[PDB]
Amino acid sequence: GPHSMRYFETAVSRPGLEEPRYISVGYVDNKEFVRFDSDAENPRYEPRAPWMEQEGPEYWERETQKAKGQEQWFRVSLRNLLGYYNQSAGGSHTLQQMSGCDLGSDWRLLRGYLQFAYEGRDYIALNEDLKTWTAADMAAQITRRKWEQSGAAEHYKAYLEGECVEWLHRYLKNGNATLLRTDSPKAHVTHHPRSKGEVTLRCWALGFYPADITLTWQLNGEELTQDMELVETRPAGDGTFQKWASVVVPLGKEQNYTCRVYHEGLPEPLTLRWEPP
Amino acid sequence: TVKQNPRYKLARVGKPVNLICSQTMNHDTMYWYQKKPNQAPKLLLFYYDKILNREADTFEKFQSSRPNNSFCSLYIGSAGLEYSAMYLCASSRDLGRDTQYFGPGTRLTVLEDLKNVFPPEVAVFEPSEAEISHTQKATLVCLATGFYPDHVELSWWVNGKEVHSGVCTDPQPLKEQPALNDSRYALSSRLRVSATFWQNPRNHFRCQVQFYGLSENDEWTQDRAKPVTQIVSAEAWGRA
């Protein structure tokens, strides 16, 4: 099974203030479990998953101190980046970080991740070997030259191969409830008259997790392309997703068209058409 | 209360140099500066807790390590002419506007060879009788001669204790032959006391000179004695 642990860090510079806005979000198999926000009344690591309550007071204090340190790392790095690009402090600048690891067949390290971005675009990233850095621009070349000399990659490799794998094994064992939860989609076809002789059949998909879904419209085996027009996968708000795929069909011949839904957790792919009411 | 040892350091071109800095105040930030004569202290790098920050212009020339909150090191590999300057270490409780506490500093001089290095010759000169007669004061003169480089710390010790009151030492030494390079230095100091104090044969006077030279790790080829980090002194007891 492909298991993963990720840490999504954000640092937005605040003009006129010493410390930037620091947000650190933790994920286990694309599910939020921990969160830190500097904008909060009491800045500390808070549990976002129910199974995360099993952790002692010593754990939360240790993680909060890591965030307070990272808050200062991003603060100084932000100031150095202004000099590299000849930017002003009066403007707001964003620095983002993505760090984590992937699990193979059964609870063993596959690939280590450590990426950085400045102003939405790729800045510096750690390669698969976890020893070499890939710099996207001339300013990042300075960062690469610094980190190769100080040996930063060795410290990140030690975490990614050690601590990251060790803690993910603990979380996957502790979290069996919300972590393994899979939701099958509920599908139905709606009728909408388009213009005079043409009609639009909309195939809905509701209450499904994860978001990875496939909707295909077909006329007795032969599928329809480009004339389909589909919508982007949107969250319902209760920890589940929504999606629909329309089709331009003639009036009276709507029964000849069938919608097929493909999703993991569904034992057999859903086959459906119009009722009618 | 920032401690920096040694006060003076000498190294050969191509040899590694390591400077240590002490805390005890449990401060989060520890800074490293470079100070050249008639120039402002230039920030090299700093350490906030475990986070290291090196300046863009400085990086490639300096490395740093912080094993714990109390100690911080500045590493030079390899040393070579341009590094010859005083290195000041600073400490601060935060990463902001709050006060920076500086250490005494480490004056580093990097040379091609260590052949011209010589320890000082310390000599005491008893006060003039005419000086005691004209004014009820006596001036003792100390002389540290034939030392290279200018890595000396002159001290006055009266009855086995270091004295700072009445002491007057030259801010800059004199060159034995200022026409050519690698000239040996000469330094003088004065201790002014009351006539009654000098005339007392119980009071002991000592001019102590702390010299900074070669270490145990450093090599020596010359048949002449090794010019190691040593204390050279001259004594006087006071005539009646």
């Binding site: 921990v34 340190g69 990272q70 790095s77 960062t143 930063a152 410290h155 | 986070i51």
Partner: peptide, 9 residues
């Protein structure tokens, strides 16, 4: 878990 970054950019 989170990791603490070493040298700054």
């Amino acid at each position: 878990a989170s990791n603490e970054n070493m040298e700054t950019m």
